[PDB]
Every structure is written in C-alpha cells, then in structure tokens.
Amino acid sequence: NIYETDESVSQYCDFQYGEDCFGVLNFALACATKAIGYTKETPKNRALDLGCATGRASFELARSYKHVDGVDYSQAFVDAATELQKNGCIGYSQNGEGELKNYKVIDREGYAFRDSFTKVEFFQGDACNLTPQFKEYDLIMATNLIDRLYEPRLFLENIHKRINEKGYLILTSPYTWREEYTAKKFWIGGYVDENGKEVSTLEGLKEILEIHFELVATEDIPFVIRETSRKFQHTISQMSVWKVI
Amino acid sequence: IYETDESVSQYCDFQYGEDCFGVLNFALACATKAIGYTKETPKNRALDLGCATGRASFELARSYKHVDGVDYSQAFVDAATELQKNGCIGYSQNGEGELKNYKVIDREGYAFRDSFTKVEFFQGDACNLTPQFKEYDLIMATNLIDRLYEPRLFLENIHKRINEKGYLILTSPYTWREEYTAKKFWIGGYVDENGKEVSTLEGLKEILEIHFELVATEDIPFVIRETSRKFQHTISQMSVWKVI
Numbered sequence: 378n379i380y381e382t383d384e385s386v387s388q389y390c391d392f393q394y395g396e397d398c399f400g401v402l403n404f405a406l407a408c409a410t411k412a413i414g415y416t417k418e419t420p421k422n423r424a425l426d427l428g429c430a431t432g433r434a435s436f437e438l439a440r441s442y443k444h445v446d447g448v449d450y451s452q453a454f455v456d457a458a459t460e461l462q463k464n465g466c467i468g469y470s471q472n473g474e475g476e477l478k479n480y481k482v483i484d485r486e487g488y489a490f491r492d493s494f495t496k497v498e499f500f501q502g503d504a505c506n507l508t509p510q511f512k513e514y515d516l517i518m519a520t521n522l523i524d525r526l527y528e529p530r531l532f533l534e535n536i537h538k539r540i541n542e543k544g545y546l547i548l549t550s551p552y553t554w555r556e557e558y559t560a561k562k563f564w565i566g567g568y569v570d571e572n573g574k575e576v577s578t579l580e581g582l583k584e585i586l587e588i589h590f591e592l593v594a595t596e597d598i599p600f601v602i603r604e605t606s607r608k609f610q611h612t613i614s615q616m617s618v619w620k621v622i
Numbered sequence: 623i624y625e626t627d628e629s630v631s632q633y634c635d636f637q638y639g640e641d642c643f644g645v646l647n648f649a650l651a652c653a654t655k656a657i658g659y660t661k662e663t664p665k666n667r668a669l670d671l672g673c674a675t676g677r678a679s680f681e682l683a684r685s686y687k688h689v690d691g692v693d694y695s696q697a698f699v700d701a702a703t704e705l706q707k708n709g710c711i712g713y714s715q716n717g718e719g720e721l722k723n724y725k726v727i728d729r730e731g732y733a734f735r736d737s738f739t740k741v742e743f744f745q746g747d748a749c750n751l752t753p754q755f756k757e758y759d760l761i762m763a764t765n766l767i768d769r770l771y772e773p774r775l776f777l778e779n780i781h782k783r784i785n786e787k788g789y790l791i792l793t794s795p796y797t798w799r800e801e802y803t804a805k806k807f808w809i810g811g812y813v814d815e816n817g818k819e820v821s822t823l824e825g826l827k828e829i830l831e832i833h834f835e836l837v838a839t840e841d842i843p844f845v846i847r848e849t850s851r852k853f854q855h856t857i858s859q860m861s862v863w864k865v866i
C-alpha cells in the first residue's frame with residue numbers, strides 16, 4: 378500500500394498542513410468549511426471524515442461538530458494524525474531537487490483547530506466495509522476517496538445506513554479512475570458502457586445515490602499537492618452534496 | 623486527418639492547445655525568452671533539441687533563418703512534420719477515466735504560420751548528434767537533461783556545435799529519477815559522499831563553465847494536462863550560457 382509509506386505520509390502532511398501554492402487555498406480547510414456550511418441546519422453532533430489521511434479535515438470539522446471520527450485504511454496515516462493530536466507536533470520531509478529533503482515541523486498549536494482537537498478520534502478502517510460503531514452521523518465527508526476504492530459500490534450503496542435522517546453525505550473527487558486502485562468494471566464513471574454510451578462519474582453517482590439521497594449542490598474545488606520543490610499536481614476536484622431522503 | 627497517439631496527443635495538447643490556469647504556452651515562452659537572450663547574436667541557425675511536437679521550432683523560426691528540430695521519438699517527429707506538411711493534425715485529449723475528446727490543430731491558426739517553411743524536423747539523439755547538426759547560433763534544449771540517461775554525454779560536447787558568441791539555453795525542473803537517469807549521472811539533486819547537497823545548477827556550472835559563461839537564470843512555469851481535472855503544474859528553471 379503506497380498510503381502506508383513514509384514518503385506518502387510526508388506528502389500528505391505537506392498537502393494538509395503546509396503552505397499554499399499557486400494561489401490555491403488549503404484543500405482540507407476549504408472542504409471542511411464548505412461542508413459545515415452545507416450542513417448548517419443540522420444538529421452537528423457527529424461527523425465522519427472517511428479517508429482522512431493525516432487528519433487535517435477531521436480537526437477542522439471538530440471546530441463545529443461535537444464529535445468527529447477520522448478513519449483511514451492506512452495505519453501510517455492514522456498514526457501520524459494521532460501523533461499530532463496527542464504529542465502536539467509531528468515532523469515530515471518535504472521534497473526538493475531529486476532525492477533532496479527539507480525537514481519541516483507541524484505544530485498543532487499554530488492552527489485555529491487547536492481549540493477542538495480533543496473532539497476527534499482517529500481509527501484505521503475500511504470505507505468499503507466499516508465496522509458497526511461508525512454510525513449515526515449528521516455528516517459523512519469523503520474527499521477524494523471513491524476513485525481510490527477497490528469497489529466503490531460497497532461504500533456508496535450502504536453509506537446511507539450510517540447517516541441520520543436529514544443528514545448529509547459530502548463527496549469530492551477528480552474522477553481519476555485507474556486500474557491500480559479500482560478494476561475498470563467497478564469505475565463509477567469515465568467509461569463507455571456496453572451500449573456505446575459515455576458514463577460520467579456524477580451520472581453514475583446519481584444512479585447509486587438517488588435511491589436514498591437528494592443531490593443538493595455541486596462545486597469545483599481546486600487543490601495543489603507538491604511532488605518536488607518545482608513539480609506539483611494541480612487538480613480540480615468536484616464536490617457533490619447529498620441529503621438523506 | 624493525421625491522427626496522433628496518447629503520448630504524442632499529450633504534447634500536441636501541451637504545445638498547441640489552450641493555456642491552462644492562466645499559464646502562458648511553455649514552448650512560446652521558451653522561444654520568446656531565447657530570442658530575447660540572443661538579441662545581439664547572428665540569427666542564422668537554431669537547434670530545438672528534444673523538440674517533441676515542434677511548437678518551439680516553429681516559434682524559433684519566426685526569428686532565425688533556419689531551425690532544426692530534433693527528437694529521439696519518431697512519433698513526435700512525424701506529428702510535427704505532418705502539421706508542417708499538411709497543415710493540420712488531430713489528437714486525443716484525455717477526459718474522465720478512459721473517455722477522450724478529439725481535437726484538431728490547424729497550422730494557419732497560429733502566428734508562426736508565417737515562418738514554418740524555415741524548419742526541418744529530424745529524428746536524432748542529443749547524446750549522439752549527427753555531424754551535420756553544427757554551426758548553431760542557438761541550441762535550445764527545454765526539459766531534456768533530466769530525461770537523459772547520461773546527460774553529461776550531451777552537455778560536455780555541445781559547445782562543438784555552437785558558433786563563437788552563440789548560446790546554449792537549457793530548461794529543467796530537475797526532477798532527477800532513476801527510471802530516466804543513473805544516480806551516478808544525476809547532475810544535481812543528490813547528497814555527495816561528504817554529506818553535502820549538490821544543486822543541479824551548480825552541477826551544470828561545473829560541466830559547462832569549461833566552455834560557457836552563465837549569463838542568466840529564470841523560472842518558467844508550465845501546465846501539462848493529464849486528465850480533464852488533473853494537471854501537472856511545474857516551475858522549470860531556464861539557464862542561459864554563452865560560448866567562450
């Protein structure tokens with residue numbers, strides 16, 4: 378699992394807690410902020426940050442929610458988030474030219490979320506088969522998760538059972554389906570079906586989710602993730618907001 | 623309708639498609655900067671080494687009497703030659719997943735249409751250039767050195783192909799990787815045996831200052847599309863070298 382490697386841990390520490398690039402705002406804060414707004418009429422007792430990686434969006438959701446669970450399949454990601462939460466700091470290696478690295482520190486006390494980090498709990502877990510304790514959520518937010526899932530339907534077709542009535546499921550994805558993560562037969566979109574029609578992922582999401590959800594809003598949210606000091610990925614993820622029916 | 627493949631299509635889109643995120647076309651920017659740095663040189667012969675689908679060759683032909691564009695990839699060379707000859711090529715832009723958007727490049731849609739007959743495209747290797755590729759007032763090799771297995775083989779001899787007072791202009795984001803370059807051949811981006819970090823610009827000075835003077839450096843951004851929603855946004859460093 379690439380998500381268990383230290384380079385991957387360092388990459389997501391930088392993306393989630395490092396400095397903004399090319400004028401693009403921090404992605405985890407943008408998503409959590411937009412998610413809180415979309416759910417402003419809800420009780421805001423329990424939220425789930427699914428695929429939380431190094432946990433930045435869990436901390437941000439906890440500024441508004443009474444309890445936040447951060448879940449990720451990578452134990453390495455979970456350890457890093459927990460270490461920052463409990464020790465108050467974590468270090469990471471920022472990439473430079475070639476193999477060169479720059480040591481950086483993330484200080485929990487340098488961020489506004491320092492007022493709410495005890496309302497978070499991080500767990501290792503599988504989004505496609507969550508254990509029963511992860512239930513009764515007002516909000517379930519899964520940013521850039523579905524196109525990394527071995528079988529996205531296992532999560533999507535069942536997630537409504539974990540959300541309270543009038544609760545929300547908020548997804549984002551750039552829809553970068555790849556066989557290294559998901560067999561083509563399981564791509565939600567980005568394929569030509571057996572009748573020569575082009576299936577968009579949002580269409581495939583409507584088909585799965587409109588059984589139990591109403592689609593409330595979509596919006597494009599850019600993000601930049603560093604690869605080296607000179608090479609970056611600059612991506613436009615699509616957020617979709619679903620209200621339990 | 624000449625049709626290009628995915629690798630060629632990516633460079634077709636990158637070199638001839640629309641500007642992404644407000645970033646100026648990379649090939650035009652590099653050629654324009656090269657022209658600016660060489661304004662007191664003769665303007666007879668320019669080599670665009672690693673020219674891919676040839677946009678910078680066309681752009682350099684607006685100022686030089688003759689421009690050679692050379693690339694290792696025959697497929698890249700044929701795309702450029704086709705756009706030069708027939709005036710149009712088609713390519714497959716990537717969208718979501720496997721979905722593709724077909725696009726057409728029209729030679730007459732660009733200002734370099736006034737100079738395209740002054741370019742010749744060839745297949746060739748920067749580390750083993752044929753002897754006819756000589757007597758250049760300018761050799762421009764953008765984003766090439768960190769794609770070479772042994773870049774020093776190209777760099778230590780290249781002054782032989784450049785006229786007196788001529789220029790060597792390089793760009794690179796210095797993304798040294800063992801899949802392209804043997805670690806022992808990395809010009810920078812590594813820790814030497816004494817624990818000191820070697821910068822690629824310094825490695826370049828060590829190789830090139832035998833026969834060149836470093837005149838200028840400048841950061842140039844570019845955006846290359848990978849899908850409809852995913853793009854690589856990179857800052858390449860241009861270095862400008864005048865032959866002694």
Ligand SMILES: C[S@@+](CC[C@H](N)C(=O)[O-])C[C@H]1O[C@@H](n2cnc3c(N)ncnc32)[C@H](O)[C@@H]1O
Nearest residue numbers: 380428430449450451502503504505520521525
């Ligand atoms: C592209 S990253 C997105 C991370 C974070 N949500 C963000 O937006 O930056 C995908 C994340 O999903 C996690 N993940 C992948 N498959 C998973 C699964 N089956 N269950 C839970 N998390 C998973 C990965 O470990 C990784 O942290």
Ligand SMILES: C[S@@+](CC[C@H](N)C(=O)[O-])C[C@H]1O[C@@H](n2cnc3c(N)ncnc32)[C@H](O)[C@@H]1O
Nearest residue numbers: 672673674693694695746747748749764765769
């Ligand atoms: C990263 S692309 C840069 C292309 C273009 N100059 C630009 O700036 O976008 C590297 C290019 O160099 C070419 N190339 C790779 N190895 C080469 C070699 N040994 N000799 C000549 N061209 C080579 C590749 O085919 C490709 O077109």
